[PDB]
Each structure stands twice: as structure tokens, then as C-alpha cells.
Amino acid sequence: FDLERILKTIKDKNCKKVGLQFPEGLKRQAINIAREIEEKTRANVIISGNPCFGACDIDTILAGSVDILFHFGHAGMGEYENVVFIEARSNIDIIPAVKTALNLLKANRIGLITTVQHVHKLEEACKVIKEYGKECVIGKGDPRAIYPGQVLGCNFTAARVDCEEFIYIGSGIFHPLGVAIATKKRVIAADPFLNQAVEVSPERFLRKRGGYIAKATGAKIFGIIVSTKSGQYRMKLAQKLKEIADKHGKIGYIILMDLVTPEQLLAFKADAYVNTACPRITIDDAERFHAPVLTPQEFEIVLGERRWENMEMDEMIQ
Amino acid sequence: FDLERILKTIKDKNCKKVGLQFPEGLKRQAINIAREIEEKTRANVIISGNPCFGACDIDTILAGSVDILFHFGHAGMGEYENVVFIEARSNIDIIPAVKTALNLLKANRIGLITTVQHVHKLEEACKVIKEYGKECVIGKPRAIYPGQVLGCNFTAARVDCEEFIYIGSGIFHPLGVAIATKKRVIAADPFLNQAVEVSPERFLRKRGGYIAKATGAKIFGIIVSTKSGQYRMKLAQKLKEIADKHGKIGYIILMDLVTPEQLLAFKADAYVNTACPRITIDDAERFHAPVLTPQEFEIVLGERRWENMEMDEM
Numbered sequence: 001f002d003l004e005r006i007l008k009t010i011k012d013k014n015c016k017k018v019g020l021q022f023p024e025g026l027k028r029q030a031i032n033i034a035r036e037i038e039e040k041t042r043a044n045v046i047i048s049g050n051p052c053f054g055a056c057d058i059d060t061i062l063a064g065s066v067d068i069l070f071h072f073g074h075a076g077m078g079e080y081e082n083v084v085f086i087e088a089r090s091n092i093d094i095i096p097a098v099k100t101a102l103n104l105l106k107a108n109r110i111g112l113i114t115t116v117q118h119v120h121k122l123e124e125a126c127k128v129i130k131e132y133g134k135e136c137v138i139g140k141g142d143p144r145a146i147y148p149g150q151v152l153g154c155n156f157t158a159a160r161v162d163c164e165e166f167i168y169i170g171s172g173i174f175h176p177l178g179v180a181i182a183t184k185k186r187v188i189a190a191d192p193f194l195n196q197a198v199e200v201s202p203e204r205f206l207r208k209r210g211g212y213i214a215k216a217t218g219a220k221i222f223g224i225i226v227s228t229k230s231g232q233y234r235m236k237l238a239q240k241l242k243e244i245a246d247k248h249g250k251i252g253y254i255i256l257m258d259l260v261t262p263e264q265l266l267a268f269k270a271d272a273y274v275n276t277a278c279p280r281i282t283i284d285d286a287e288r289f290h291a292p293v294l295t296p297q298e299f300e301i302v303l304g305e306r307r308w309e310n311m312e313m314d315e316m317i318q
Numbered sequence: 319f320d321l322e323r324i325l326k327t328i329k330d331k332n333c334k335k336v337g338l339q340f341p342e343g344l345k346r347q348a349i350n351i352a353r354e355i356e357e358k359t360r361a362n363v364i365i366s367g368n369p370c371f372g373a374c375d376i377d378t379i380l381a382g383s384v385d386i387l388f389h390f391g392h393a394g395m396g397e398y399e400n401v402v403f404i405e406a407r408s409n410i411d412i413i414p415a416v417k418t419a420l421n422l423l424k425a426n427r428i429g430l431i432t433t434v435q436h437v438h439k440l441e442e443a444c445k446v447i448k449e450y451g452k453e454c455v456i457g458k459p460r461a462i463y464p465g466q467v468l469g470c471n472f473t474a475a476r477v478d479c480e481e482f483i484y485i486g487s488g489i490f491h492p493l494g495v496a497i498a499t500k501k502r503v504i505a506a507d508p509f510l511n512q513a514v515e516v517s518p519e520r521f522l523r524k525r526g527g528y529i530a531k532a533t534g535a536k537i538f539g540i541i542v543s544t545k546s547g548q549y550r551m552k553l554a555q556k557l558k559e560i561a562d563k564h565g566k567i568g569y570i571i572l573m574d575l576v577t578p579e580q581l582l583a584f585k586a587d588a589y590v591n592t593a594c595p596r597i598t599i600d601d602a603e604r605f606h607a608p609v610l611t612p613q614e615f616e617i618v619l620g621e622r623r624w625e626n627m628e629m630d631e632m
């Protein structure tokens with residue numbers, strides 16, 4: 001990533017103190033970057049040592065005690081006074097993986113989505129698809145993120161476009177799964193780190209979640225989990241869910257925490273939990289919890305306030 | 319503890335929202351207590367789910383969104399306007415351990431110190447020591463109770479006497495008293511009813527090795543905790559400047575929890591901990607790189623003679 005701009009920014013503004021925040025994969029570079037900033041500018045650097053899961057997870061205590069917080073690795077989320085997002089993009093060629101998925105397309109209007117690592121390469125991919133003879137749309141998502149076509153585990157607005165199928169560019173199965181479910185459209189996952197392209201079927205995902213719903217039908221006491229992280233806090237929803245719970249003869253207790261981990265939930269024995277924090281906790285960490293952990297809408301289905309056929313992906317709406 | 323004073327407090331103050339914070343051993347009670355408050359009052363309850371290590375670790379985000387935060391298991395400290403502290407007094411008998419410690423006494427004026435759980439039983443212990451024919455004194459804001467010591471606070475032992483009896487379990491508090499005051503300390507455990515003189519020579523030798531391992535270090539991480547009662551950023555900035563004065567480099571790392579996992583994420587050779595002093599001592603062998611107290615870091619830098627090492631107090 002572009003360290004020269006960071007130094008120029010600091011050096012132009014005569015920053016007394018500078019803050020650095022890294023996602024877990026980038027922390028190994030934190031000390032090298034702080035060295036570069038202290039060597040080449042006059043600012044003192046404070047490093048954030050908490051786990052950081054994304055731009056939903058800004059260290060606002062550190063931002064409020066430094067002149068500028070550089071948050072690395074993610075597209076911007078929200079609107080912060082003195083937080084500067086440093087994007088950190090990937091070099092990997094995605095066009096070989098794009099052409100691979102072209103042989104699986106069964107429609108002519110193709111929507112393109114990807115993650116922040118690859119978003120600067122979508123236009124290239126859009127022109128390959130268009131020369132192959134197809135139409136290609138890239139929707140706009142979070143307006144506070146400079147690049148369109150970007151999806152998050154909690155945000156599928158870049159997939160709400162006039163198109164027939166989607167090519168998702170990236171690794172991992174969660175995002176194309178969520179798009180498929182949120183759009184009811186066919187999603188082809190093109191992994192550029194493998195030069196392979198496969199269709200994603202959400203039926204297996206949907207069966208597993210129906211199993212957690214079924215598994216919680218007998219639950220009487222629910223822990224409703226709230227996170228204080230800057231972009232994950234949904235207390236208003238949590239209080240509605242408590243009221244819904246009580247309306248159906250069940251009991252919910254609101255548990256407010258920072259990190260949402262199986263170990264901390266194990267300390268409060270309830271029959272099931274409802275996670276209003278990061279939606280990916282519910283899915284990626286499902287098997288690590290000692291009792292069923294439900295999205296807010298799955299909870300509604302468990303109590304009767306929503307029908308199974310209306311189950312939507314959990315999306316971050318604070 | 320007293321549920322009835324909690325409910326009375328909630329109803330008289332007309333609370334609509336109440337917070338509960340517990341240490342890890344008491345968290346298994348959180349749901350029962352929340353249920354009791356919701357059944358017997360009009361308040362809605364929010365339970366803090368974070369780990370909580372003491373009255374140094376108030377959940378201030380929760381406190382800021384409720385009318386009253388009940389904090390269980392520690393004595394108060396600091397001054398938070400809407401935080402009520404609900405102490406957990408131990409009711410174990412300490413007098414036999416006191417009587418067992420009389421035999422090891424060498425002097426005539428004895429100081430008494432203990433942890434917060436036993437602090438209401440020190441008067442009785444004082445009478446016993448008096449009847450034995452000795453003088454007994456119980457020394458006196460963080461450690462708000464007479465005779466109470468904390469891992470980060472030994473002011474109750476800054477009292478005029480020749481010898482100390484520590485009543486409680488563990489060796490950190492009596493070791494700390496012995497290092498802070500250079501007096502003889504007898505530790506009297508009321509659960510086992512045993513008493514032994516505590517001598518710091520082996521502890522200091524162990525701390526000396528971590529200083530030795532850290533003198534070779536190129537890059538220090540200077541740890542600051544944002545916890546309400548552990549935050550020492552000013553100290554961190556002083557340490558960073560003094561290190562630089564000696565041609566050594568430290569970077570400040572600001573975090574909430576201070577764990578070996580979060581520190582392994584960074585490529586520093588050694589760490590200076592400005593947060594809870596017990597982390598440095600009790601979690602020592604769990605860290606990949608050596609963790610120092612501020613005073614041990616001063617020794618590594620030649621700012622402080624090894625002979626003048628002292629306990630890290632908040």
C-alpha cells in the first residue's frame with residue numbers, strides 16, 4: 001500500500017500523534033509501518049492492539065486521542081472525522097478466473113461483485129465480459145466506499161441491480177452464498193487464487209440454518225447479544241427482539257459486549273442466542289457455540305413473527 | 319449479597335434501565351439477578367458481557383447508557399456517578415490463621431494487611447494480637463479500606479510498624495509488601511490455617527532474568543490499557559521518551575484486554591506493561607517475549623539501579 005501518501009499527509013499537516021489500526025492479517029506489518037512514520041516524519045505513532053475485523057470495527061478511543069487514525073485494509077464504512085482508510089489491494093490477475101466463469105453463464109445480463117481487494121480491477125473484468133458479447137452491470141453499494149460492486153458479509157446492496165446472474169470475484173463461499181439468497185439469482189464464484197469458477201448453491205446453507213431454527217424451537221430463555229463495535233451496534237433492534245420475545249411467552253436478556261466469542265457466551269447459560277452483531281459470527285462460528293445462535297430474522301421465525309419463506313440474509317442496518 | 323438494597327435503590331431512583339457487571343466467577347448469576355430486577359421493578363436490565371477483572375475495569379460504555387450500573391464482587395475505587403459497588407465479603411474465619419502466625423512473630427509492633435474480602439474481620443484479629451502483648455496497627459483512596467492491599471496498591475502497608483502479618487491466599491501481596499517496605503512479612507492463609515515467612519529473594523531473582531532477557535531487545539512495545547482504572551498513557555509517553563534518550567525505540571500499543579494472543583500479533587522483542595501490574599507477574603510465562611514493569615524497564619535502560627527496584631503501583 002501507498003505509504004508515501006501517508007507520510008506526505010502527516011508531514012503536510014504536522015501531526016503530533018498518529019494512530020494505526022490493522023486487521024488481524026496485517027498486524028505483522030504494524031511495527032515496520034510505525035517505524036517508517038516515526039523515522040520519516042516527526043509524529044509519535046500509537047498502534048491499536050485490539051482485534052479488528054473490518055471497517056465496522058473502528059478503534060474510536062484511539063481515534064479520539066490522536067490527530068489522524070490510519071485504518072488499514074478496508075474500504076471506508078460510515079463517516080469519521082479523523083479516520084483515513086488505506087485500501088490495501090491485491091495484485092492477483094482476475095481475468096483468467098473471469099474467462100473461466102464465462103463458460104458457465106446461462107444468461108446475457110451479468111452482474112459483477114467482489115471484495116475490496118479486487119474492486120479496482122472490476123472495470124477490466126466488465127470489459128472482458130462485454131467483448132464476450134454479454135451485458136455487464138456493476139451496482140453501487142455503500143456510498144461511503146469509493147468503489148462500486150463491493151460486497152460485505154453484512155451488505156449486499158452492490159448486488160441489487162438489474163441483471164440476471166452474478167459473477168462473484170474472490171475466494172471463500174460466504175459472499176456469493178449471501179448474494180444468491182438475497183437476490184434469488186444464480187451466482188458463479190470465480191476464485192482468482194485458484195483460476196477456477198463454480199456455481200454456488202445455497203440449498204445446503206439453507207438446510208443447515210433451518211436445523212438451527214428447529215434446534216431452538218424448545219428454547220425458553222434467549223440471550224440477545226449486542227456489540228459496542230462502531231459499525232456492529234444494534235441495541236434498538238435488540239430491544240425490539242426482547243419485546244417480541246416477551247410477546248410470545250419467552251424471555252430475552254440483552255448482553256452488551258465488545259468481542260462476541262463462544263467463551264463469553266458460555267459464561268451466560270441460556271437455551272439459545274440471538275446475535276445482533278456481525279452477521280458472519282452467526283454463520284462462520286456456528287459450530288463453535290454450545291447452543292444455537294440465531295440471526296434476528298431466524299429468531300422471528302422461531303417465535304412465529306416471520307414465516308420460513310421470508311427468511312432474508314442478516315444485513316447490518318444500525 | 320443484598321438483593322433487597324438493590325431493588326430498593328432501583329425503585330427509589332425510578333430507574334428505567336439498569337446495568338449489571340460481574341467478574342468471571344459471578345457471571346453465572348447474571349441472568350438470575352437480571353430476572354429478579356425485571357420481575358420486581360419497572361427497570362430494563364443490560365448485562366455486561368465483557369471479561370471484568372476488578373473495580374479498575376468499569377464498563378463505562380454500559381454505565382453511560384443506563385441510569386445505574388451495579389458492579390459486583392469488588393470494592394469501589396474511582397468516582398463514577400452512577401456506579402454502585404456490591405462487595406462480596408468472605409465469611410471464612412481468619413482468627414486461627416492469625417493465631418498460627420503469632421508463633422513466627424519476632425517484633426512488638428505488628429502491621430496487619432489483607433484483601434478486601436477479609437477487611438471487615440481485621441478488628442477481631444487486632445484484639446487477638448493485642449492480647450498476645452503486641453502492638454497492632456491497621457494502615458489506611460484506591461484501596462479505600464483500612465488494611466486493604468491490592469496488586470497495584472500497597473499504601474495500607476505504609477504505616478509505622480516493624481513486621482507485617484498478611485491474611486489471605488497467594489504470595490503476590492505479601493511479596494509486594496516485603497519489597498515496598500523492606501520489612502519482615504508473615505503470610506497467614508485462613509483457608510489452610512498455615513503461616514509462613516515470605517521472603518522476596520526468589521521473586522527478585524526471577525524478575526532479574528526477565529530484565530536480563532530484555533536488555534538484548536531492539537524494539538519495545540509499550541502497552542496501555544483503555545480500562546477505566548488501568549489507563550496510564552502519560553506514563554507510556556514518559557517511558558517512550560526516556561527510552562529514546564538511551565537510544566532505544568518503543569512504540570505505544572493501546573488496547574483493552576492485554577493478552578498473550580494479542581501481543582503475539584506484533585513483531586516486538588520485548589514489552590513494557592503500563593496496565594494491571596499483575597499481568598506482568600502472573601501471566602509472565604504465558605508471553606512469547608519478556609514483559610516488564612515500568613521500573614524494570616528503567617533498570618534495563620540504566621535509569622534505575624537494580625538495587626532500587628520497586629513494586630509497580632497505579
Ligand SMILES: C[S@@+](CC[C@H](N)C(=O)[O-])C[C@H]1O[C@@H](n2cnc3c(N)ncnc32)[C@H](O)[C@@H]1O
Pocket residue numbers: 053054151152153154227229232258259260261277278280281284285
Ligand atoms: C473474516 S471477518 C469478515 C470479512 C469481511 N469483513 C467481509 O466483508 O466479509 C468475519 C469474522 O470476524 C469475526 N468477528 C466479527 N465481528 C466480531 C465481534 N464483534 N466479536 C468477535 N468476532 C467478530 C467473526 O469470527 C467473523 O467470522
Ligand SMILES: CSC[C@H]1O[C@@H](n2cnc3c(N)ncnc32)[C@H](O)[C@@H]1O
Pocket residue numbers: 371372543545548574575576577593594596597600601
Ligand atoms: C483479576 S486479578 C488480576 C488478573 O486479571 C487479569 N487482568 C487484569 N487486567 C487485565 C487487562 N487489562 N487485560 C487482560 N487481563 C487482565 C490478569 O490475568 C491478572 O493476572
Ligand code: SF4
Pocket residue numbers: 053054055056057152153154155231232277278279280281316
Ligand atoms: S461482515 Fe461482520 S466483520 Fe465484515 S464488515 Fe460486516 S459486521 Fe464487519
Ligand code: SF4
Pocket residue numbers: 371372373374375468469470471547548593594595596632
Ligand atoms: S491488581 Fe490489576 S486487576 Fe487488581 S485492582 Fe489493581 S489493576 Fe485491577
